[PDB]
A paper describes a structure:
Similarly, we resolved a partial contracted tail structure, including 15 sixfold sheath rings, at 3.9 Å, which also allowed us to build the atomic models for the tail sheath protein gp22. The tail terminator and tail tube structures did not resolve at high resolution, probably due to the different helical parameters between the sheath and the tail tube in the contracted tail, resulting in the problem of center-alignment. Tail-contraction causes the length of the tail sheath to decrease to 940 Å, and the width of the sheath to increase to 275 Å, and the pore diameter of each sheath ring to increase from 82 Å to 108 Å, resulting in the tail tube’s detachment from the sheath. Vertical compression of the sheath results in a smaller helical rise of 18 Å and a larger twist of 32°. The separation of the tail tube from the sheath provides the necessary conditions for the tail tube to penetrate the membrane. Structural comparison of the sheath protein gp22 in the extended and contracted states revealed that the dramatic conformational changes occur at the N-terminus and C-terminus. Specifically, the C-terminus of gp22 oscillates at a small angle, whereas the N-terminus oscillates upward by nearly 100°. Remarkably, the “handshake” and β-sheet augmentation mechanisms of the sheath–sheath interaction are still preserved in the contracted states. Our structures confirm that the N-terminus and C-terminus of the sheath act as a hinge, while the rest of the sheath acts as a rigid-body motion. The baseplate was not found in our contracted tail, suggesting that some degree of damage to the baseplate during sample preparation led to its detachment.
The phage tail is a macromolecular machine responsible for specifically recognizing host bacteria, penetrating the cell membrane, and forming a channel for genome delivery. The conserved structural components include three main parts: a baseplate, a long inner tail tube, and a tail sheath that wraps around the tube. Phage P1, a temperate phage first discovered in 1951, transfers DNA into a wide range of gram-negative bacterial species by universal transduction and has been used to construct a fine structural genetic map of E. coli. During the tail-contraction, the tail sheath undergoes a massive conformational change and contracts to half and more of its original length, exposing the inner tail tube and providing the energy to drive the tail tube to eventually penetrate the target cell membrane.
Author numbering:
A (entry chain b): 3 to 528
B (entry chain h), C (entry chain c): 482 to 528
D (entry chain h): 338 to 433
The structure:
């Protein structure tokens, strides 16, 4: 046929305007997905990077669980295991300065040499070294050891010689498995069988998870690789992970702050550094993200209260943050021995269970402390301080959540409170979750409506906000106000004020539902 | 419509023609341009 | 029919005869010619 | 296939043309040449030349400069439209 023009001119031809649709605009936000983020010390992982762990592949990413014999190192992995039973998450690994990774350098002839370098430092190539290969994963080549083999290959039209690199893993007993196989060429312009580019640094950065390579530009032209079998990486050791400086924790927190991925909750994976907890609370307040924190279980009942005040969270600046204390002990599943845990992740599990009760709205109504939401399933619990009882009123004043014995003999979280000094309905965790969800949805929807003529954007904002509020009311989030004489029966009241010519204000008022914490009954005779 | 309905009429535009000079002739028109949404601010309130 | 029904009557044509001068005589007729479809424009809208 | 540096001229004209085409007879000059869908800046790949550095928004507003930002879908976008007018007498906007 022929082209169809648009916005016809002054005569003759006809035109069809582009398709116009604006009342159909909508914003797609899950509002039910819950994800957790945290930092910790793990046996295997890439230092100071955000790593995504799921229910299936978390063990491979984080490596083998740490032995309980070592001090203050088994807590993060087991907290991650407890918290990951519901949803996936993001972790940041912290490493001491003493740790290092191995590097294998190749000469012009092909004679290999071995060295070890710290994680932060960048490698340097001296004269006579064609290139170097190091491990990006950071797992030390102890116990299961990684070995590299080189084989020759055929050319491809242009005569660019290529070779096969094979990385294998060998256990202590002698079991050998093939991990990776790749075809790489020293020539800058090389092609694979399927047409993929064949350059060792580019190929490793594109389709490899373990190895990276750096090639000295001086010796790229004159370099030859011969047949070498079973090249083993030299000794790479991990420093004492029991002692971690505050600077490393701060750097890990800063790295976690700048993460493109979205996470719904922030968890303290066995971190007892006050500065790190304050930074995590600042991140939670900045991102309007719920946060859970744990006081050191080693402290007694009397010493628990000053510990909360020691952390810089007791104030009105951090509202969504919550804290817990758990001084009991249990048994590890992997190793049959006594262990002490921190009550972090169980609260996240309760929150996830409460969220999953609804599909579209999100189901953020339920507090993370209930008869069925929180159960704390563990092998066996032995109290560490018998013949001693806590003070309930002191804990309420200090904003601490305690534990009790359930009807079926299972330990249970009997209260949910946040780190808010005032009693202005904010110490409860039920309301900030709803408010944060509403604010996030409003920000996401308003971001799309930027730079619009007046009137159209008013209708769009009103329609979207009314739909969201109606959905929340239908889900049961909002209840009629407790004062019907002074306040209208409408659960929510929304108003839009243009005010300034370019600025524009929106106000919404909601009545959160009630939480049954104390029940009192009296008998009367008639 | 003008942002000040008390001081200004509801008509978006006001036009007037004045002959004035015998050969010269003046026309005046006043319009109220629409608003542009550049900054949006929202506050949460509890009832 | 005229394109302005408020200012003009619905009659397509209006005719008037004025004797005026004793020997002269005037006739006036007004008609509204039909429209010619030279440019056609269409827009799609979603509901 | 090589690195190049461009000047942001024509993209604003493209946004203006897209805004104009929204109406047939009147002209559709309402929309400013900086919007979520009007301006998208479609290019193969963008690499910043000055990382670890941030501009001053208030200084740009005072100096009547239009900046760029990152959109929701990862596309660079023009987030403001201002003209070379010193006064704030509704004339710094390009819409009027």
């Amino acid at each position: 046929q022929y082209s169809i023009q648009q916005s016809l001119g002054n005569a003759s031809g006809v035109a069809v305007s582009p398709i116009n649709a604006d009342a159909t605009l909508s914003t797609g936000v899950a509002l039910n997905s819950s994800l957790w983020a945290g930092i910790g010390v793990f046996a295997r992982g890439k230092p100071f990077t955000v790593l995504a762990v799921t229910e299936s592949n978390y063990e491979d990413v984080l490596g083998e669980p740490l032995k309980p014999s070592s001090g203050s190192q088994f807590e993060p992995i087991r907290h991650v295991y407890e918290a990951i039973q519901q949803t996936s998450g993001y972790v940041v690994r912290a490493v001491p300065d003493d740790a290092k990774f191995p590097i294998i350098m190749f000469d012009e002839s092909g004679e290999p040499a071995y060295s070890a370098l710290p994680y932060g430092s960048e490698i340097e190539l001296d004269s006579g070294e064609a290139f170097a290969i190091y491990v990006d994963d950071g797992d030390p080549c102890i116990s299961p050891t990684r070995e590299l083999t080189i084989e020759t290959a055929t050319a491809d039209s242009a005569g660019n010689e290529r070779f096969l690199l094979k990385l294998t893993q060998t256990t202590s007993l002698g079991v050998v498995t093939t991990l990776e196989t790749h075809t790489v060429s020293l020539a800058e312009e090389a092609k694979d069988d399927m047409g993929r580019l064949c350059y060792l640094p580019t190929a490793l950065e594109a389709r490899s998870k373990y190895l990276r390579a750096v090639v000295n530009e001086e010796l790229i032209s004159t370099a030859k690789v011969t047949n070498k079998k079973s090249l083993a990486f030299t000794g790479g050791t991990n420093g004492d992970q029991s002692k971690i400086s505050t600077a490393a924790y701060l750097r890990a927190v800063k790295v976690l702050n700048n993460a493109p991925y979205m996470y719904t909750a922030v968890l303290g994976l066995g971190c007892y550094d006050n500065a790190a907890i304050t930074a995590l609370g600042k991140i939670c307040a900045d991102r309007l993200i719920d946060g859970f924190f744990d006081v050191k279980p080693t402290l007694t009942y009397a010493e628990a209260l000053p510990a909360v005040e020691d952390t810089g969270l007791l104030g009105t600046d951090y509202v969504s943050c919550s804290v817990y204390h758990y001084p009991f002990s249990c048994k590890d599943k992997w190793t049959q021995s006594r262990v002490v845990f921190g009550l972090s992740g169980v609260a996240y599990a309760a929150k996830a269970r409460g969220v999953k009760k609804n599909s579209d709205v999100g189901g953020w109504h339920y507090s993370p402390a209930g008869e069925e939401r929180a159960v704390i399933a563990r092998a066996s619990i032995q109290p560490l301080y018998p013949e001693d009882t806590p003070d309930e009123e002191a804990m309420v004043k200090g904003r601490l959540n305690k534990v009790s014995v359930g009807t079926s003999g299972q330990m249970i979280i009997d209260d949910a409170l946040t780190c808010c000094t005032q009693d202005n309905y904010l110490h409860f965790q039920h309301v900030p979750s709803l408010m944060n969800a509403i604010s996030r949805f409003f920000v996401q929807l308003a971001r799309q409506m930027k730079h619009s003529p007046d009137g159209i954007t008013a209708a769009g904002l009103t329609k979207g906000m009314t739909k969201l509020l109606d959905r929340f009311v239908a889900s049961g989030a909002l209840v009629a106000p407790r004062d019907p004489d002074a306040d209208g029966t409408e659960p929510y009241v929304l108003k839009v004020t243009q005010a300034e010519f370019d600025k524009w204000e929106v106000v919404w008022a909601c009545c959160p539902t009630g939480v049954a914490r104390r029940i009192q009954g009296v008998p009367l005779l008639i």
